[PDB]
Amino acid sequence: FDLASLAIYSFWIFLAGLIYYLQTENMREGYPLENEDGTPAANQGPFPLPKPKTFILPHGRGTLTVPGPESEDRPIALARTAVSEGFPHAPTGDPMKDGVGPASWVARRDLPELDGHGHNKIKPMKAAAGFHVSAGKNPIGLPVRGCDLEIAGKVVDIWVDIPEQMARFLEVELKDGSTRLLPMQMVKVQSNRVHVNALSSDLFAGIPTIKSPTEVTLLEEDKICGYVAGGLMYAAPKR
Amino acid sequence: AEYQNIFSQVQVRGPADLGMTEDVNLANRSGVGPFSTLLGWFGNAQLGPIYLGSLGVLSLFSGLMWFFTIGIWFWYQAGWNPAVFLRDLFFFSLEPPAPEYGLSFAAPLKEGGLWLIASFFMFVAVWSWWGRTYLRAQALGMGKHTAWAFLSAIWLWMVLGFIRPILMGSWSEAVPYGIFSHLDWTNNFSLVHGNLFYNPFHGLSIAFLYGSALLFAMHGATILAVSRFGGERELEQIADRGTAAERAALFWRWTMGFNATMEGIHRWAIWMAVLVTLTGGIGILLSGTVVDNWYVWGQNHG
Amino acid sequence: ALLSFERKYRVPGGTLVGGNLFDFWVGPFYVGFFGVATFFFAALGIILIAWSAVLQGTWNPQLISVYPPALEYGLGGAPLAKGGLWQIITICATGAFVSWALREVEICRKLGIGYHIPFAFAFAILAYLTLVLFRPVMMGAWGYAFPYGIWTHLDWVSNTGYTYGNFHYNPAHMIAISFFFTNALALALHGALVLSAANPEKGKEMRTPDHEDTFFRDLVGYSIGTLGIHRLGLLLSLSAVFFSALCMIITGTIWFDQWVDWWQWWVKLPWWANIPGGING
Ligand code: BCL
Ligand code: BCL
Ligand SMILES: CC[C@H]1c2cc3[nH]c4c(c3C)C(=O)[C@H](C(=O)OC)c4c3nc(cc4[nH]c(cc(n2)[C@@H]1C)c(C(C)=O)c4C)[C@@H](C)[C@@H]3CCC(=O)OC/C=C(\C)CCC[C@H](C)CCC[C@H](C)CCCC(C)C
Ligand SMILES: CC[C@H]1c2cc3[nH]c4c(c3C)C(=O)[C@H](C(=O)OC)c4c3nc(cc4[nH]c(cc(n2)[C@@H]1C)c(C(C)=O)c4C)[C@@H](C)[C@@H]3CCC(=O)OC/C=C(\C)CCC[C@H](C)CCC[C@H](C)CCCC(C)C
Ligand SMILES: COC1=C(OC)C(=O)C(C/C=C(\C)CC/C=C(\C)CC/C=C(\C)CC/C=C(\C)CC/C=C(/C)CC/C=C(\C)CC/C=C(/C)CC/C=C(/C)CC/C=C(\C)CCC=C(C)C)=C(C)C1=O
Ligand SMILES: COC1=C(OC)C(=O)C(C/C=C(\C)CC/C=C(\C)CC/C=C(\C)CC/C=C(\C)CC/C=C(\C)CC/C=C(\C)CC/C=C(/C)CC/C=C(/C)CC/C=C(\C)CCC=C(C)C)=C(C)C1=O
Ligand SMILES: COC(C)(C)C/C=C/C(C)=C/C=C/C(C)=C/C=C/C(C)=C/C=C\C=C(C)\C=C\C=C(/C)CC/C=C(\C)CCC=C(C)C
Ligand SMILES: CCCCCCCCCCCC[N+](C)(C)[O-]
Ligand SMILES: CCCCCCCCCCCC[N+](C)(C)[O-]
Ligand SMILES: CCCCCCCCCCCC[N+](C)(C)[O-]
Ligand SMILES: CCCCCCCCCCCC[N+](C)(C)[O-]
Ligand SMILES: CCCCCCCCCCCC[N+](C)(C)[O-]
Ligand SMILES: CCCCCCCCCCCC[N+](C)(C)[O-]
Ligand SMILES: CCCC[C@H](O)[C@H](O)CO
Ligand SMILES: [Cl-]
Ligand SMILES: [Fe+3]
Ligand SMILES: [K+]
Ligand SMILES: [K+]
Known part of the structure; x- marks a missing residue:
């Protein structure tokens, strides 16, 4: 007989089922798989989509049910470079402006993330009661330099995550008096400047702008973060 | 830089x-x-x-x-x-x-x-x-995921100090409270049961332990890599997938041919971790109660 | 086939070598110059394992074992059937792993993401190389490396460890294990915490990271925070592997006696060395 043999055989049956379950749970976004033209792929693999689950979202924001119909919900300015599958797709315009490649953004909801109390999670520090810089070089006041070593603007605030008490963006004022948000993760605060490797100074103007000066929506965050990260590949030319 | x-x-x-x-x-x-x-x-x-x-x-x-x-x-x-x-x-x-x-x-x-x-x-x-x-x-x-995950750790602790000693019929089988002495206990436990490397639940426990370091290194690195897109705001990425979660998925898709989602990586995570002590407690509990010698056992099974 | 949201990312660019020549995919897999290198190294390696299998006289994957040259060969080359295949296979492995890492770098570049992943992977690669390259070279023979076999490599672990008594007494090994156990604890907690907020009690709204901080503060008086926990996992994992490589690189080189005896430096400090009582007096 043997209880240890029963246990090891049983465990391997269990683990196979567990892996099957875990894989299907991980197909709740992005599937069914598509051809390059957006139509459903003929081979979906041996794992089926899981039965749907529904997340109840806080503050009257509704629900998310996944899996569900996938749609990009935005135009994608790319075209095939080959006559068969598997090759890159070339930007049909300016990929920074069009938001493709590493400049890509997702059509998230055009509302701000809220905290557990239903208040905007990210606020400019100037509007965040009691918030202040508590350690490190305070970036407010510093000129902002791009990868061309030219000054694009000056830091006029920090946008802070209120519940998690963290710096999320720098607000940078440009020569025309408008501002843009830069992700904190993409700037280097130095003693005499903030340096931004991803963008040359002349690309700061094109950072997507926010529709209201004291809040930022998840859609806007995705457009800002995407554009800034896309500069690593695309700031290149010059001239 | x-x-x-x-x-x-x-x-x-x-x-x-x-x-x-x-x-x-x-x-x-x-x-x-x-x-x-x-x-x-x-x-x-x-x-x-x-x-x-x-x-x-x-x-x-x-x-x-x-x-x-x-x-x-x-x-x-x-x-x-x-x-x-x-x-x-x-x-x-x-x-x-x-x-x-x-x-x-x-x-x-x-x-x-x-x-x-x-x-x-x-x-x-x-x-x-x-x-x-x-x-x-x-x-x-x-x-209640935390209480359930903690129960897997509790299973190994209980097997070690309580269930296995009771099944063996003596408290002498339990772990002593000391720094060196509990390491000496561990070595001896393996020697006395024929080398735990031959206990398949030990090899599994190791696969999950090493696998937990593989996976948290993967996952921590991944989230930091997409923190420039708000990647660590995981709950809202679950609710409203963003370019952080898509770039994370595609790094792994392109690397190894499949990927997770922002919620599902946490299920892979919780199981990789808990299986350390779930398989481990089974391996220890069978030792001496059902199997005196894992080398011997492995010659007649697998 | 592509994920529904994938096409917009499949643009040209980011390669380190070859320009556009290998800038394409096979199914889900990105290729790149380093995809080709990984394929060459892996394939050659696997072919050489199969030839080793033929020279050993078995196809059973639980029996195939490729051993390094015996200690008498020192750091020279050995005949292929007597350690040379191991040597070439190790070159292939190292080539395959480093190529995999560099391919990961080409993928990060195309996706516009940080390089944290391949940097992390490099710790694993360096632990591998500590075992098969740096340690053997410092000890003066390829034969101190581990053999490539599912079970024979465990034989090497047990034989190497018991060469120094109970290996548990290696202080770097104690630190390494503490990081491995801490990492698994942190992984369980992190997975649990996020799922417990995303999947709250029946009928309830998803919780927020605020609830995640609250839960931990309530339980232990501290929350490391959603950025911190990912920093932490990465540090715990990589520290575990750093201290593993460390625990082995010092073993057989700077310390080669029984590890238990290392601890005598402390017991024998002159201010208390001769005091009666205790385990040691
Ligand atoms: C010479 C030694 C033997 C050997 C003997 C043993 C024995 C004996 C055991 C293991 C076990 C394990 N071994 Mg072995 N092991 C050997 C060789 C190895 C090697 C190796 C590279 O050679 C590796 C990687 C491992 C790896 C492993 C792990 C996978 C596993 C423990 C998992 C775990 O998380 O435990 C740590 C987790 C716990 C102990 C859970 C603790 C939970 C409780 C509830 C915590 C209470 C806290 C307390 C109240 C204090 C609070 C203080 C706070 C500050 C407040 N072994 C050799 C062959 N090994 C264990 C196992 O499961 O084996 C099947 C075990 O029992
Ligand atoms: C009797 C045996 C001795 C002992 C002797 C040894 C010896 C000897 C060693 C360890 C080592 C370790 N031991 Mg000890 N150890 C003992 C008891 C234990 C116990 C315990 C609970 O008792 C524990 C928890 C540990 C724990 C550990 C870890 C600290 C460390 C192993 C991990 C590591 O190096 O990862 C590092 C990770 C790697 C090496 C993996 C590298 C992966 C590569 C880069 C990629 C592979 C890809 C693959 C080919 C792809 C295939 C195809 C795809 C899957 C498709 N030991 C007993 C006392 N221990 C080892 C160590 O520190 O090594 C540096 C080591 O050599
Ligand atoms: C699933 C596998 C892993 C796991 C999971 C896990 N552990 C857990 C949990 C989970 C999911 C919890 O929810 C629970 C927790 O609360 O974590 C924060 C826990 C926990 N795992 C713990 C420990 C622990 N887990 C371990 C391992 C693991 N835990 C696995 C690898 C290990 C080892 C040996 O590897 C240890 C030592 C505790 C931190 C915590 C459970 C706490 C507990 O039960 O506490 C009761 C004890 C007290 C309330 C007070 C004890 C007092 C101290 C002993 C003395 C302190 C006084 C002095 C003034 C300070 C001295 C400090 C020194 C000791 C350094
Ligand atoms: C540094 C912390 C931890 C870590 C991290 C880590 N590992 C990683 C990564 C990271 C961040 C990846 O990005 C990478 C990955 O793609 O994961 C999905 C990877 C990876 N970790 C892997 C495995 C692995 N990691 C381990 C450990 C760890 N990885 C650490 C604990 C272990 C062990 C024993 O603990 C293993 C087995 C692979 C899944 C993947 C690397 C894939 C890769 O390199 O692919 C290219 C190579 C091939 C396809 C095959 C090469 C074949 C050889 C030419 C011949 C075989 C030689 C081999 C030496 C024989 C060994 C026999 C054994 C029985 C001993
Ligand atoms: C969604 O987002 C999330 C958050 O955001 C919202 C979160 O907030 C959190 C919550 C997360 C946290 C609150 C953080 C949790 C913290 C950890 C998991 C651990 C962090 C730990 C470290 C950074 C350091 C650990 C140190 C290591 C590994 C090196 C230590 C090496 C050793 C060899 C230890 C040796 C100890 C000895 C010899 C003991 C000394 C001697 C004695 C005689 C006393 C011993 C006393 C005892 C009681 C014996 C038991 C001892 C233990 C257990 C010792 C403790 C061990 C240590 C290693 C310290 C999560 C999960 C999350 O998901
Ligand atoms: C939050 O976010 C996150 C995600 O998302 C949201 C994620 O997803 C993940 C990722 C995590 C998971 C999905 C969880 C599950 C993961 C684990 C438990 C970790 C362990 C993983 C595994 C064990 C899987 C390992 C798999 C691997 C390494 C891949 C398998 C690999 C192959 C088959 C190798 C193939 C690839 C190669 C060779 C490189 C390049 C590719 C090519 C196709 C090369 C082609 C080139 C040629 C020249 C071909 C020529 C062909 C010829 C001549 C003929 C062919 C001949 C043959 C014999 C074949 C994380 C962490 C995350 O945090
Ligand atoms: C300065 O000095 C002071 C005194 C002030 C403080 C110093 C304190 C010190 C030096 C403390 C040292 C503590 C140490 C070194 C602890 C080490 C502990 C270790 C390594 C423990 C390891 C394993 C323990 C296990 C697995 C224990 C399991 C125990 C159980 C499962 C409990 C089972 C319960 C039993 C047997 C009781 C049954 C009775 C009933 C009613 C159920
Ligand atoms: C050790 C655990 C390894 C688990 C790996 C299982 C994953 C297989 C998933 C491939 C399916 C992807 N696909 C085709 C649906 O897109
Ligand atoms: C010795 C300590 C005793 C353990 C503490 C018991 C608390 C368990 C909580 C379970 C409560 C379940 N329920 C549905 C009644 O809420
Ligand atoms: C949730 C992730 C699941 C990962 C599965 C990893 C399987 C590792 C294979 C180890 C085999 C050990 N042994 C001796 C039992 O045969
Ligand atoms: C421990 C063994 C792990 C092996 C898992 C390998 C990953 C499978 C990737 C499957 C994707 C291939 N595809 C898209 C053509 O289906
Ligand atoms: C897991 C890390 C444990 C950290 C423990 C921190 C506890 C601090 C609790 C604050 C108590 C302040 N008080 C009440 C003394 O004034
Ligand atoms: C010789 C000096 C070496 C320093 C030791 C390195 C320890 C592990 C490094 C992990 C660093 C990355 N992390 C996780 C903190 O982000
Ligand atoms: C009795 C079982 C023997 C196994 C057999 O000799 C091996 O597969 C040889 O490859
Ligand atoms: Cl689950
Ligand atoms: Fe996470
Ligand atoms: K303020
Ligand atoms: K015995």
């Missing part, structure tokens, strides 16, 4: 965050502790508040009694000499009853009794703390 978001460049602080209320009895929350700027370079600066109700007090009291029972035994072994206490600290050990005592509670204090008292206090501390992990989640309306 390029910033990597391993330590923060600038810290911000606001009023102390007293937390969400939900159904929590606020009367049992402490005030906040001090803020630590040192910690704040890597994680949150804020210390406290802590919740401590009757169960938490019982758990801390009992845990302290466990630690102090072992500790006074150490002092005793030190001949009450502070110099000797520091010198031989890792050599002291509170040991269980000899095998001749079986599972009785009749061993003298100095020959197992104190081990039983200490173990009793540990039993109460850990299970009351388990109760806390459940009730703290319940009071906030959260699922």
Whole structure:
């Protein structure tokens, strides 16, 4: 007989089922798989989509049910470079402006993330009661330099995550008096400047702008973060 | 150079965050502790508040009694000499009853009794703390995943000190409380059962342990890599997938041909972790009870 | 086939070598110059394992074992059937792993993401190389490396460890294990915490990270925070592997006696060395 043999055989049956379950749970976004033209792929693999689950979202924001119909919900300015599958797709315009490649953004909801109390999670520090810089070089006041070593603007605030008490963006004022948000993760605060490797100074103007000066929506965050990260590949030319 | 978001460049602080209320009895929350700027370079600066109700007090009291029972035994072994206490600290050990005592509670204090008292206090501390992990989640309306995950760790602990010794018929089989002595116990356990490398549940426990380091290295790296797109705001990425979650998925899709989602990586995570101690407790529990010698067993099975 | 949201990312660019020549995919897999290198190294390696299998006289994957040259060969080359295949296979492995890492770098570049992943992977690669390259070279023979076999490599672990008594007494090994156990604890907690907020009690709204901080503060008096926990996992994992490589690189080189005896430096400090009492007096 043997209880240890029963246990090891049983465990391997269990683990196979567990892996099957875990894989299907991980197909709740992005599937069914598509051809390059957006139509459903003929081979979906041996794992089926899981039965749907529904997340109840806080503050009257509704629900998310996944899996569900996938749609990009935005135009994608790319075209095939080959006559068969598997090759890159070339930007049909300016990929920074069009938001493709590493400049890509997702059509998230055009509302701000809220905290557990239903208040905007990210606020400019100037509007965040009691918030202040508590350690490190305070970036407010510093000129902002791009990868061309030219000054694009000056830091006029920090946008802070209120519940998690963290710096999320720098607000940078440009020569025309408008501002843009830069992700904190993409700037280097130095003693005499903030340096931004991803963008040359002349690309700061094109950072997507926010529709209201004291809040930022998840859609806007995705457009800002995407554009800034896309500069690593695309700031290149010059001239 | 390029910033990597391993330590923060600038810290911000606001009023102390007293937390969400939900159904929590606020009367049992402490005030906040001090803020630590040192910690704040890597994680949150804020210390406290802590919740401590009757169960938490019982758990801390009992845990302290466990630690102090072992500790006074150490002092005793030190001949009450502070110099000797520091010198031989890792050599002291509170040991269980000899095998001749079986599972009785009749061993003298100095020959197992104190081990039983200490173990009793540990039993109460850990299970009351388990109760806390459940009730703290319940009071906030959260699922009970933590209490379930903690139960996998509790399974190995219980097998080691309680279930296996009871099934073997003596407390002498349990783990002593000492730094070196518990490592000596572990080595001996393996030698006596024919080399645990031949126990398939041990090899699995190792696959999950190593796999937990593989996976948290993958996952931590991944989230940091997409932190420039808000990647660590995982709950909202679950609710409203963003370019962080898509770039993360596609890194792995392009690398190894498949990927996770922002929620599902956490299910891979919780299982990779818990399976360490679930498979481990099974492997230990069968040892000596069902299988005297894993080498021998492996010659007739697999 | 592509994920529904994938096409917009499949642009040209990011390669380190070859320009557009290997800038394409096979199914889900990105290729790149380093995809070709990984394929060459892996394939050659696997072919050489199969030839080793033929020279050993077995196809059973639980029996195939490729051993390094015996200690008498020192750091020279050995005949292919007597350690040379191991040597070439190790070159292939190292080539395959480093190529995999560099391919990961080409993928990060195309996606516009940080390089944290391949940097992390490099710790694993360096632990591998500590075992098969740096340690053997410092010890003066390829034969101190581990053999490539599912079970024979465990034989090497047990034989190497017991060469120094109970290996548990290696202080770097104690640190390494503490990081491995701490990492698994942190992984369980992190997975649990996020799922418990995303999947709250029946009928309830998803919780927020605020609830996640609250839960931990309530339980232990501290929350490391959603950025911190990912920093922490990465540090705990990589520290575990750093201290593993460390624990082995010092073993057989700077310390080669029984590890238990290392601890005598402390017990024998003159201010308490001769005091009566205790385990040691
Ligand atoms: C010479 C030694 C033997 C051997 C003997 C053993 C024995 C004996 C055991 C293991 C076990 C394990 N071994 Mg082995 N092992 C050997 C060789 C190895 C090698 C190797 C590279 O050679 C590796 C990688 C491992 C790896 C492993 C792990 C996978 C596993 C433990 C998992 C775990 O998380 O435990 C750690 C987790 C716990 C102990 C859970 C603790 C939970 C409790 C509830 C915590 C209470 C806290 C307390 C109240 C204090 C609070 C203090 C706080 C500050 C408040 N072994 C050799 C062959 N190994 C264990 C196992 O499961 O084997 C199947 C085990 O019992
Ligand atoms: C009797 C045996 C001795 C002992 C002797 C040894 C010896 C000897 C060693 C260890 C090592 C370790 N031991 Mg010890 N150890 C013992 C008891 C234990 C116990 C315990 C509970 O008792 C534990 C928890 C541990 C724990 C550990 C870890 C600290 C460390 C192993 C991990 C590591 O190096 O990862 C590092 C990770 C790697 C090496 C993996 C590299 C992966 C590569 C880069 C990629 C592979 C890709 C693959 C080919 C792809 C295939 C195809 C795809 C899957 C499709 N030991 C007993 C006392 N221990 C080892 C160590 O520190 O090594 C540096 C080591 O050599
Ligand atoms: C699933 C596998 C892994 C796992 C999971 C896990 N552990 C858990 C949990 C989970 C999911 C919890 O929810 C629970 C927790 O609350 O974590 C924060 C826990 C926990 N795992 C713990 C420990 C632990 N886990 C371990 C391992 C693991 N835990 C696995 C690898 C290990 C080892 C050996 O590897 C240890 C030591 C505790 C931190 C915590 C459970 C706490 C508990 O039960 O506490 C009761 C004890 C007290 C209330 C008080 C004790 C008092 C002290 C002993 C003395 C302190 C006094 C002195 C003034 C300070 C001295 C400090 C020194 C000791 C350094
Ligand atoms: C540094 C922390 C931890 C870590 C991290 C880590 N590992 C990683 C990564 C990271 C961040 C990846 O990005 C990468 C990955 O793609 O994971 C999905 C990877 C990876 N970790 C892997 C495995 C692995 N990692 C381990 C460990 C760890 N990885 C650490 C604990 C272990 C062990 C034993 O603990 C293993 C087995 C692979 C899944 C993947 C690397 C894939 C790769 O390199 O692919 C290219 C190579 C091939 C397809 C095959 C090469 C074949 C050889 C030419 C011949 C075989 C030689 C081999 C030496 C024989 C060994 C026999 C054994 C029986 C001893
Ligand atoms: C969604 O987002 C999330 C958040 O955001 C919202 C979160 O907030 C959190 C919550 C997360 C946290 C609150 C952080 C949790 C913290 C950890 C998991 C651990 C962090 C730990 C470290 C950074 C350091 C650990 C140190 C290591 C590994 C090196 C230590 C090496 C050793 C060899 C230890 C040796 C110890 C000895 C010899 C003991 C000394 C001698 C004695 C005689 C006393 C012994 C006493 C005892 C009681 C014996 C038991 C001892 C233990 C257990 C020792 C403790 C061990 C240590 C290693 C310290 C999560 C999960 C999350 O998901
Ligand atoms: C939050 O976010 C996150 C995600 O998302 C949201 C994630 O997803 C993940 C990722 C995590 C998971 C999905 C969880 C599950 C993961 C684990 C438990 C970790 C362990 C993983 C595994 C064991 C899987 C390992 C798999 C691997 C390494 C891949 C398998 C690999 C191959 C088959 C190798 C193939 C690839 C190669 C060779 C490189 C390049 C590719 C090519 C196709 C090369 C082609 C080139 C040629 C020249 C071909 C020529 C062909 C010829 C001549 C003929 C062919 C001949 C043959 C014999 C074939 C994380 C962490 C995350 O945090
Ligand atoms: C300065 O000095 C003072 C005294 C002030 C403080 C110093 C204290 C010291 C030095 C403390 C040292 C503590 C140490 C070194 C502790 C080490 C502990 C270790 C390594 C423990 C390891 C494993 C323990 C296990 C697996 C225990 C499992 C126990 C159980 C499952 C409990 C089972 C319960 C039993 C047997 C009781 C049964 C009775 C009932 C009623 C159920
Ligand atoms: C050790 C655990 C390894 C688990 C790997 C299982 C994953 C297979 C998933 C491939 C399916 C992807 N696909 C085709 C649906 O897109
Ligand atoms: C897992 C890490 C444990 C950290 C423990 C921190 C506890 C601090 C609790 C604050 C208490 C402040 N008080 C009440 C003393 O004033
Ligand atoms: C020795 C300590 C005793 C353990 C503490 C028990 C608390 C368990 C909580 C489960 C409560 C379940 N329920 C549905 C009644 O809420
Ligand atoms: C949730 C992730 C699941 C990962 C599965 C990893 C399987 C590792 C294979 C180890 C085989 C050990 N042994 C001796 C039992 O055969
Ligand atoms: C421990 C073994 C792990 C092997 C898992 C390998 C990953 C499978 C990738 C499957 C994707 C291939 N595809 C898209 C053509 O289906
Ligand atoms: C010789 C000096 C080496 C320093 C030791 C390195 C320890 C592990 C490094 C992990 C660093 C990355 N992390 C996780 C903090 O982000
Ligand atoms: C009795 C079982 C023997 C196994 C057999 O000799 C091996 O597969 C040889 O490859
Ligand atoms: Cl699950
Ligand atoms: Fe996470
Ligand atoms: K303010
Ligand atoms: K035996």
